[PDB]
Design a protein around this ligand. Structure first.
Ligand SMILES: [Cd+2]
Ligand SMILES: [Cd+2]
Ligand SMILES: [Cd+2]
Ligand SMILES: [Cd+2]
Length: 31
């Protein structure tokens, strides 16, 4: 496993440190 339930586990911005403020349903930062 990695950090979020909104992104697919293997992301390009969340790879070493998390950027998301909502965290467990939907985000406006990884589009
Ligand atoms: Cd996320
Ligand atoms: Cd992400
Ligand atoms: Cd994350
Ligand atoms: Cd995000």
């Amino acid at each position: 496993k990695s950090c979020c339930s909104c992104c697919p586990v293997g992301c390009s911005k969340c790879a070493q440190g998390c950027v998301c403020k909502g965290a467990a349903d939907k985000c406006t930062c990884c589009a």
